[PDB]
Short mmCIF file of C-alpha atoms and ligand atoms in Angstrom, two decimals:
data_model
loop_
_atom_site.label_atom_id
_atom_site.label_comp_id
_atom_site.label_asym_id
_atom_site.label_seq_id
_atom_site.Cartn_x
_atom_site.Cartn_y
_atom_site.Cartn_z
CA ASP A 1 19.01 -7.69 -38.25
CA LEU A 2 16.75 -9.55 -35.83
CA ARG A 3 18.47 -11.35 -32.95
CA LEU A 4 17.50 -14.91 -32.03
CA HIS A 5 16.08 -15.60 -28.56
CA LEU A 6 15.26 -19.18 -27.61
CA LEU A 7 12.23 -19.49 -25.34
CA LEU A 8 13.30 -19.40 -21.71
CA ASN A 9 10.51 -21.91 -20.99
CA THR A 10 12.15 -25.00 -22.50
CA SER A 11 8.90 -27.00 -22.26
CA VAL A 12 7.58 -25.08 -25.30
CA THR A 13 9.43 -26.93 -28.04
CA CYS A 14 9.66 -27.49 -31.78
CA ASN A 15 8.72 -30.86 -33.28
CA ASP A 16 11.85 -32.71 -32.12
CA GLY A 17 11.77 -31.29 -28.58
CA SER A 18 14.37 -28.59 -29.19
CA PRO A 19 13.33 -25.19 -27.79
CA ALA A 20 11.24 -22.82 -29.87
CA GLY A 21 12.16 -19.16 -30.17
CA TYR A 22 11.79 -15.82 -31.88
CA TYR A 23 13.92 -13.20 -33.64
CA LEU A 24 13.68 -9.69 -32.19
CA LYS A 25 14.64 -6.19 -33.26
CA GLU A 26 13.60 -3.62 -30.67
CA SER A 27 12.61 -0.05 -31.56
CA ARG A 28 12.75 1.94 -28.32
CA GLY A 29 10.93 4.93 -29.83
CA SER A 30 7.90 2.92 -30.97
CA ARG A 31 4.85 1.44 -29.24
CA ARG A 32 3.95 -0.73 -32.25
CA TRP A 33 4.86 -4.43 -32.28
CA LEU A 34 4.76 -6.71 -35.32
CA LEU A 35 4.85 -10.46 -34.64
CA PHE A 36 5.25 -12.41 -37.89
CA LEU A 37 4.39 -16.11 -38.11
CA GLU A 38 6.44 -18.06 -40.65
CA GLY A 39 4.74 -20.54 -42.97
CA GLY A 40 5.76 -23.73 -44.72
CA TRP A 41 2.98 -26.34 -45.12
CA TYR A 42 2.59 -28.99 -42.36
CA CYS A 43 2.67 -32.75 -41.73
CA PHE A 44 -0.22 -34.90 -40.54
CA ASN A 45 1.12 -38.37 -39.66
CA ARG A 46 4.20 -39.99 -38.14
CA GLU A 47 5.70 -41.24 -41.40
CA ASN A 48 5.09 -37.99 -43.30
CA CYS A 49 6.58 -35.92 -40.46
CA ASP A 50 9.55 -38.31 -40.50
CA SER A 51 10.15 -37.38 -44.15
CA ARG A 52 9.83 -33.67 -43.28
CA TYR A 53 12.50 -34.23 -40.62
CA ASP A 54 14.98 -35.47 -43.23
CA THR A 55 14.83 -32.58 -45.69
CA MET A 56 13.03 -29.73 -43.87
CA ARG A 57 14.58 -30.05 -40.42
CA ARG A 58 14.76 -26.29 -39.80
CA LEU A 59 10.95 -26.31 -39.93
CA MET A 60 11.00 -28.97 -37.19
CA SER A 61 14.01 -28.04 -35.03
CA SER A 62 15.93 -25.04 -33.70
CA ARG A 63 19.27 -26.85 -33.42
CA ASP A 64 20.56 -25.27 -36.65
CA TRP A 65 18.87 -21.85 -36.64
CA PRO A 66 21.18 -18.89 -37.31
CA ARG A 67 21.80 -16.32 -34.61
CA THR A 68 20.44 -13.44 -36.73
CA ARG A 69 17.93 -12.86 -39.51
CA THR A 70 17.46 -9.97 -41.92
CA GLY A 71 14.15 -8.14 -41.66
CA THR A 72 12.64 -7.92 -45.15
CA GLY A 73 9.46 -6.39 -46.50
CA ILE A 74 7.08 -5.57 -43.67
CA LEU A 75 9.83 -6.65 -41.26
CA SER A 76 12.29 -4.16 -42.77
CA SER A 77 13.21 -0.99 -40.88
CA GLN A 78 14.03 1.07 -43.97
CA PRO A 79 11.07 3.30 -44.91
CA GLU A 80 11.96 2.79 -48.58
CA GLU A 81 11.26 -0.93 -48.23
CA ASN A 82 8.54 -0.67 -45.56
CA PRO A 83 6.51 2.56 -45.83
CA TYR A 84 3.97 1.07 -43.40
CA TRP A 85 5.68 0.10 -40.12
CA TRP A 86 9.39 0.74 -40.66
CA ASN A 87 9.81 2.10 -37.11
CA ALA A 88 7.94 -0.71 -35.31
CA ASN A 89 9.36 -3.42 -33.08
CA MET A 90 9.99 -6.46 -35.30
CA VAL A 91 9.42 -10.06 -34.22
CA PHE A 92 9.95 -13.08 -36.50
CA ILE A 93 8.62 -16.35 -35.04
CA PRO A 94 10.10 -19.35 -36.90
CA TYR A 95 7.63 -22.08 -37.86
CA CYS A 96 8.91 -25.28 -36.24
CA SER A 97 5.67 -27.03 -35.21
CA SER A 98 4.31 -28.24 -38.61
CA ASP A 99 0.77 -27.81 -37.23
CA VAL A 100 -0.42 -24.58 -38.92
CA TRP A 101 0.23 -22.95 -35.51
CA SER A 102 -2.65 -24.92 -33.95
CA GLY A 103 -1.08 -27.62 -31.78
CA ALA A 104 -0.92 -27.76 -28.00
CA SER A 105 0.43 -31.27 -27.33
CA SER A 106 3.92 -32.02 -26.03
CA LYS A 107 6.26 -34.85 -26.98
CA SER A 108 6.01 -37.75 -24.53
CA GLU A 109 6.33 -41.54 -24.57
CA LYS A 110 3.19 -41.65 -26.75
CA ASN A 111 4.10 -38.90 -29.26
CA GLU A 112 7.17 -39.04 -31.49
CA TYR A 113 6.82 -35.29 -32.16
CA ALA A 114 5.62 -32.26 -30.22
CA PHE A 115 3.01 -30.02 -31.89
CA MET A 116 2.87 -26.81 -29.85
CA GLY A 117 2.33 -24.03 -32.40
CA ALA A 118 -0.50 -22.44 -30.41
CA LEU A 119 1.55 -22.51 -27.20
CA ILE A 120 4.61 -21.11 -29.01
CA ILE A 121 2.76 -17.89 -29.92
CA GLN A 122 1.39 -17.67 -26.38
CA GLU A 123 4.85 -18.12 -24.86
CA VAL A 124 6.45 -15.56 -27.19
CA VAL A 125 3.84 -12.90 -26.38
CA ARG A 126 4.30 -13.75 -22.71
CA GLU A 127 8.08 -13.46 -22.81
CA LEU A 128 8.01 -10.28 -24.94
CA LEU A 129 6.05 -8.37 -22.29
CA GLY A 130 9.23 -8.00 -20.24
CA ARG A 131 11.16 -6.61 -23.22
CA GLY A 132 8.84 -3.70 -24.09
CA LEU A 133 5.55 -5.32 -25.19
CA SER A 134 3.94 -4.27 -21.88
CA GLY A 135 3.95 -0.66 -23.09
CA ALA A 136 2.77 -1.54 -26.58
CA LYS A 137 -0.01 0.45 -28.23
CA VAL A 138 -0.76 -1.97 -31.11
CA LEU A 139 0.22 -5.65 -31.43
CA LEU A 140 -0.05 -6.76 -35.07
CA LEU A 141 -0.02 -10.56 -35.42
CA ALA A 142 1.00 -11.22 -39.04
CA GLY A 143 1.89 -14.31 -41.03
CA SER A 144 2.24 -15.79 -44.50
CA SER A 145 0.88 -19.06 -45.94
CA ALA A 146 0.53 -21.44 -42.95
CA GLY A 147 1.48 -18.49 -40.76
CA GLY A 148 -1.37 -16.59 -42.39
CA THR A 149 -3.86 -19.27 -41.40
CA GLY A 150 -2.17 -19.29 -37.99
CA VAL A 151 -3.07 -15.63 -37.53
CA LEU A 152 -6.75 -16.48 -38.04
CA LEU A 153 -6.43 -19.36 -35.56
CA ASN A 154 -4.62 -17.39 -32.84
CA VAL A 155 -5.39 -13.65 -33.03
CA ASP A 156 -8.34 -13.87 -30.62
CA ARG A 157 -6.35 -16.06 -28.22
CA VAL A 158 -3.57 -13.46 -28.10
CA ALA A 159 -6.13 -10.73 -27.41
CA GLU A 160 -7.75 -12.90 -24.73
CA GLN A 161 -4.30 -13.57 -23.26
CA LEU A 162 -3.49 -9.87 -22.82
CA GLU A 163 -6.72 -8.80 -21.11
CA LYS A 164 -6.50 -11.81 -18.77
CA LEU A 165 -2.96 -10.66 -17.92
CA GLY A 166 -3.99 -7.04 -17.30
CA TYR A 167 -3.09 -5.25 -20.56
CA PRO A 168 -6.37 -3.90 -21.99
CA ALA A 169 -4.61 -0.97 -23.70
CA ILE A 170 -2.77 -3.23 -26.18
CA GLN A 171 -4.91 -3.36 -29.33
CA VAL A 172 -4.39 -6.81 -30.86
CA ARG A 173 -4.86 -7.01 -34.63
CA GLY A 174 -4.21 -9.58 -37.34
CA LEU A 175 -2.72 -9.62 -40.82
CA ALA A 176 -3.23 -12.90 -42.69
CA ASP A 177 -1.24 -13.21 -45.93
CA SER A 178 -1.81 -16.06 -48.41
CA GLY A 179 -3.60 -18.12 -45.76
CA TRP A 180 -7.16 -17.72 -47.07
CA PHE A 181 -7.93 -21.05 -48.75
CA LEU A 182 -11.01 -22.66 -50.26
CA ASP A 183 -12.16 -26.20 -49.51
CA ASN A 184 -13.19 -26.50 -53.15
CA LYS A 185 -12.90 -29.51 -55.47
CA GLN A 186 -9.64 -30.23 -57.27
CA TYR A 187 -9.48 -29.81 -61.03
CA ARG A 188 -8.16 -33.37 -61.41
CA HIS A 189 -8.51 -36.00 -58.70
CA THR A 190 -5.36 -37.19 -56.92
CA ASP A 191 -4.45 -39.63 -54.16
CA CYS A 192 -3.88 -37.84 -50.85
CA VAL A 193 -0.47 -39.26 -49.93
CA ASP A 194 1.58 -36.09 -49.26
CA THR A 195 1.02 -32.54 -48.04
CA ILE A 196 1.50 -30.62 -51.31
CA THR A 197 -0.84 -32.59 -53.58
CA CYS A 198 -3.62 -33.64 -51.19
CA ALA A 199 -7.22 -32.53 -50.86
CA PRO A 200 -7.11 -29.48 -48.52
CA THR A 201 -9.98 -30.89 -46.46
CA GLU A 202 -8.79 -34.37 -45.63
CA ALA A 203 -5.25 -33.28 -44.87
CA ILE A 204 -6.43 -30.88 -42.16
CA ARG A 205 -8.84 -33.51 -40.81
CA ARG A 206 -6.11 -36.04 -40.07
CA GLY A 207 -3.62 -33.37 -39.00
CA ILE A 208 -5.82 -31.55 -36.47
CA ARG A 209 -6.24 -34.85 -34.53
CA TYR A 210 -2.60 -35.90 -34.96
CA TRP A 211 -1.68 -32.45 -33.57
CA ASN A 212 -4.50 -32.16 -31.04
CA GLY A 213 -4.91 -28.80 -32.72
CA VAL A 214 -7.04 -26.03 -31.25
CA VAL A 215 -9.32 -23.61 -33.09
CA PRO A 216 -10.92 -20.30 -32.03
CA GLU A 217 -13.74 -20.63 -29.55
CA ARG A 218 -16.79 -19.25 -31.37
CA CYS A 219 -15.85 -21.19 -34.50
CA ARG A 220 -15.41 -24.35 -32.41
CA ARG A 221 -18.91 -23.96 -30.96
CA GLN A 222 -20.51 -23.52 -34.39
CA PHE A 223 -19.04 -26.60 -36.09
CA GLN A 224 -18.49 -28.63 -32.88
CA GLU A 225 -16.44 -31.77 -32.28
CA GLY A 226 -15.25 -33.75 -35.29
CA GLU A 227 -15.78 -30.75 -37.59
CA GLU A 228 -13.12 -28.38 -36.21
CA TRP A 229 -11.25 -28.72 -39.53
CA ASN A 230 -13.72 -26.15 -40.90
CA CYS A 231 -12.10 -23.41 -38.80
CA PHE A 232 -8.85 -23.76 -40.79
CA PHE A 233 -10.56 -22.10 -43.77
CA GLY A 234 -10.62 -18.29 -43.73
CA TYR A 235 -14.14 -17.68 -45.00
CA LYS A 236 -15.55 -19.90 -42.21
CA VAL A 237 -13.43 -18.77 -39.25
CA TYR A 238 -13.15 -15.05 -40.08
CA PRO A 239 -16.80 -14.12 -39.28
CA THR A 240 -16.31 -15.50 -35.74
CA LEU A 241 -13.32 -13.36 -34.66
CA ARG A 242 -13.78 -10.06 -32.89
CA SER A 243 -10.25 -8.72 -33.45
CA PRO A 244 -9.62 -6.65 -36.60
CA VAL A 245 -7.98 -8.80 -39.28
CA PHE A 246 -6.64 -7.52 -42.61
CA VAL A 247 -6.67 -10.29 -45.24
CA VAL A 248 -4.09 -10.34 -48.06
CA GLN A 249 -4.70 -13.07 -50.62
CA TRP A 250 -3.76 -13.62 -54.24
CA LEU A 251 -6.87 -14.52 -56.21
CA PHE A 252 -4.89 -17.37 -57.81
CA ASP A 253 -2.64 -18.55 -54.99
CA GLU A 254 -0.02 -21.08 -56.09
CA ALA A 255 -0.60 -23.18 -52.97
CA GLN A 256 -4.33 -23.19 -53.73
CA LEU A 257 -3.70 -24.37 -57.30
CA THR A 258 -1.25 -27.02 -56.04
CA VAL A 259 -3.75 -28.64 -53.67
CA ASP A 260 -6.29 -28.28 -56.50
CA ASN A 261 -3.84 -30.16 -58.78
CA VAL A 262 -3.62 -27.34 -61.32
CA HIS A 263 -0.25 -27.09 -63.09
CA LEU A 264 0.21 -24.30 -65.64
CA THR A 265 3.02 -25.50 -67.91
CA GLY A 266 2.77 -22.98 -70.74
CA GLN A 267 0.64 -24.80 -73.28
CA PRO A 268 -2.71 -23.32 -74.39
CA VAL A 269 -5.23 -23.76 -71.58
CA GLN A 270 -8.31 -25.77 -72.53
CA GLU A 271 -11.87 -24.66 -71.82
CA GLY A 272 -12.28 -26.95 -68.81
CA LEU A 273 -9.20 -25.61 -67.04
CA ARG A 274 -9.98 -22.05 -68.14
CA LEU A 275 -13.45 -22.19 -66.56
CA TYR A 276 -12.01 -23.88 -63.46
CA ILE A 277 -9.48 -21.06 -62.98
CA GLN A 278 -12.00 -18.27 -63.62
CA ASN A 279 -14.46 -19.93 -61.22
CA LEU A 280 -11.76 -20.14 -58.53
CA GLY A 281 -11.02 -16.42 -58.77
CA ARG A 282 -14.74 -15.67 -58.65
CA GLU A 283 -15.21 -17.87 -55.57
CA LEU A 284 -12.36 -16.20 -53.67
CA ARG A 285 -13.70 -12.80 -54.72
CA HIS A 286 -17.08 -13.81 -53.32
CA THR A 287 -15.67 -14.91 -49.94
CA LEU A 288 -14.03 -11.47 -49.53
CA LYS A 289 -17.11 -9.30 -50.35
CA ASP A 290 -17.89 -8.97 -46.63
CA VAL A 291 -14.26 -8.62 -45.50
CA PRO A 292 -13.87 -4.83 -45.08
CA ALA A 293 -10.04 -4.79 -44.83
CA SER A 294 -8.64 -6.89 -47.66
CA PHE A 295 -6.09 -6.81 -50.49
CA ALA A 296 -6.66 -9.37 -53.26
CA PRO A 297 -4.77 -8.86 -56.54
CA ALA A 298 -5.53 -11.02 -59.56
CA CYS A 299 -2.09 -12.63 -59.73
CA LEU A 300 -0.62 -16.12 -59.74
CA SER A 301 1.91 -15.94 -56.90
CA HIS A 302 2.55 -16.95 -53.28
CA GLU A 303 3.14 -14.76 -50.19
CA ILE A 304 3.98 -11.06 -50.25
CA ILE A 305 4.33 -9.21 -46.96
CA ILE A 306 7.95 -10.23 -46.20
CA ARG A 307 9.14 -9.99 -49.81
CA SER A 308 11.45 -7.01 -50.32
CA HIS A 309 9.40 -5.84 -53.34
CA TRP A 310 6.01 -6.08 -51.60
CA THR A 311 5.57 -2.34 -52.30
CA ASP A 312 5.21 -2.82 -56.06
CA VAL A 313 1.83 -4.54 -56.43
CA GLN A 314 -1.23 -2.30 -56.63
CA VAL A 315 -4.99 -2.87 -56.69
CA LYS A 316 -7.03 -0.03 -58.22
CA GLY A 317 -3.97 2.20 -57.93
CA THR A 318 -3.35 1.61 -54.21
CA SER A 319 -0.40 -0.37 -52.87
CA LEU A 320 -0.57 -2.82 -49.99
CA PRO A 321 1.48 -0.62 -47.59
CA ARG A 322 -0.93 2.25 -48.27
CA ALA A 323 -3.98 0.04 -47.71
CA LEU A 324 -2.46 -1.11 -44.42
CA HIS A 325 -1.88 2.52 -43.46
CA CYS A 326 -5.51 3.29 -44.36
CA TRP A 327 -6.50 0.33 -42.17
CA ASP A 328 -4.57 1.91 -39.28
CA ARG A 329 -6.45 5.17 -39.89
CA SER A 330 -9.83 3.40 -39.99
CA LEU A 331 -9.14 1.97 -36.51
CA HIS A 332 -8.49 5.27 -34.71
CA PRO A 333 -15.14 5.85 -44.95
CA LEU A 334 -11.80 7.56 -45.59
CA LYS A 335 -11.33 9.89 -48.56
CA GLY A 336 -8.75 8.63 -51.05
CA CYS A 337 -7.49 6.02 -48.55
CA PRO A 338 -9.23 2.73 -49.37
CA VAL A 339 -9.09 -0.41 -47.26
CA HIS A 340 -11.13 -2.95 -49.29
CA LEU A 341 -9.16 -3.65 -52.49
CA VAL A 342 -10.16 -6.75 -54.48
CA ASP A 343 -9.47 -7.13 -58.20
CA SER A 344 -12.44 -7.86 -60.45
CA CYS A 345 -10.64 -8.96 -63.62
CA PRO A 346 -10.89 -12.75 -63.94
CA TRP A 347 -7.54 -14.13 -65.16
CA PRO A 348 -4.02 -14.49 -63.76
CA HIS A 349 -1.97 -11.33 -64.20
CA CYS A 350 -4.75 -9.15 -65.59
CA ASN A 351 -3.53 -6.70 -62.97
CA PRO A 352 -0.45 -5.17 -64.66
CA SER A 353 1.41 -4.76 -61.34
CA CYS A 354 1.54 -8.51 -60.66
CA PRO A 355 4.97 -9.94 -59.75
CA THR A 356 6.93 -11.03 -62.81
C1 LIG B 1 3.93 -22.63 -47.99
N1 LIG B 1 2.55 -23.09 -48.02
C2 LIG B 1 1.80 -23.18 -46.78
O1 LIG B 1 2.32 -22.87 -45.77
C3 LIG B 1 0.34 -23.66 -46.80
C4 LIG B 1 -0.35 -24.18 -47.87
C5 LIG B 1 -1.69 -24.56 -47.60
C6 LIG B 1 -2.12 -24.34 -46.34
S1 LIG B 1 -0.77 -23.65 -45.48
C7 LIG B 1 -3.41 -24.64 -45.91
C8 LIG B 1 -3.84 -24.09 -44.66
C9 LIG B 1 -5.12 -24.36 -44.19
C10 LIG B 1 -5.99 -25.15 -44.93
C11 LIG B 1 -5.57 -25.68 -46.14
C12 LIG B 1 -4.26 -25.42 -46.63
C13 LIG B 1 -3.79 -26.01 -47.99
C14 LIG B 1 -2.66 -25.17 -48.65
C1 LIG B 2 5.95 -23.46 -19.91
O1 LIG B 2 4.90 -23.66 -20.86
C2 LIG B 2 4.01 -24.74 -20.53
C3 LIG B 2 3.02 -24.86 -21.66
O2 LIG B 2 2.31 -23.64 -21.86
C4 LIG B 2 3.34 -24.46 -19.18
O3 LIG B 2 2.54 -25.58 -18.82
C5 LIG B 2 4.40 -24.21 -18.11
O4 LIG B 2 3.77 -23.83 -16.89
C6 LIG B 2 5.35 -23.12 -18.55
N1 LIG B 2 6.39 -22.90 -17.56
C7 LIG B 2 6.80 -21.69 -17.18
C8 LIG B 2 7.88 -21.65 -16.14
O5 LIG B 2 6.32 -20.66 -17.66
#
């Protein structure tokens, strides 16, 4: 189990002003540290965050968090469940900022909610240095869904934080799971009123300014003010990072289809929707051609790395834990140890190892 620690700096808060925190399981015989960023969509205005506070309060507050949490998947310490990093120090950072880990504004008389996702990561890394992170050999910043996008938004800031604090030996790396989205056109137009069924562009646009969200520096200088929403999309922000980032992304992510307003009921799919789905898989495949460390199975699913059966899926005969191990080896063309694994078949579940 991972033990809950609320941030000693109580000025770094969740949405409702309650303190943020992190779950920790130390491994005294390891110099490898895995910091996982939880996901769970976001909210971009006062009245939509108010609704999130009624029925998703744990994603906005720490007042009801449990004292412990079970490490699953890549956060598991059993080698059977986690062949990759079972012996590493495990850190689970709950997502309680609703800002895709980008905000850096505190709750005041002008803000009903605090959006401090970017400062939460910074404060956790800071406070972990006194509990063993100072002697770390690799810091892997991982995350799923919104936490996956958060890795892309924060991995260079964490690396910049550690050098400026005098820890050049800590190799900061990123693992972004199911956070690689396309700002494509929906299959059927909808009215952007919520977070689930809104155009992925315009939702980020209003959120980033509601949050006062921050984006990585080189990406900010390319797109410049008013266009920082572009850096929330993997294929635009990834080329600007220097830190190594392994990208895990279903070719047919359920969250991607949701914001695209695609709903597979079970009826025979018409030509229009069939071409739309095949074109989506092709577009994602294209955005990953120049991503050397990637794992993209042709499945309709959502998230993977913290699921207990994340070992089952395979691309071209190689599992994700193996590809991540090969990635570790590449960072010390490997024989029989591939690191770029992207399916080429064009329909959901054409890979037989897809989750059922
Ligand atoms: C549990 N589902 C999530 O957490 C997220 C879903 C999406 C996210 S996060 C997203 C992130 C950046 C840009 C655009 C989007 C739209 C879809
Ligand atoms: C707490 O975090 C805030 C935001 O990063 C910072 O301004 C403040 O100095 C921190 N306080 C301490 C004691 O670290």
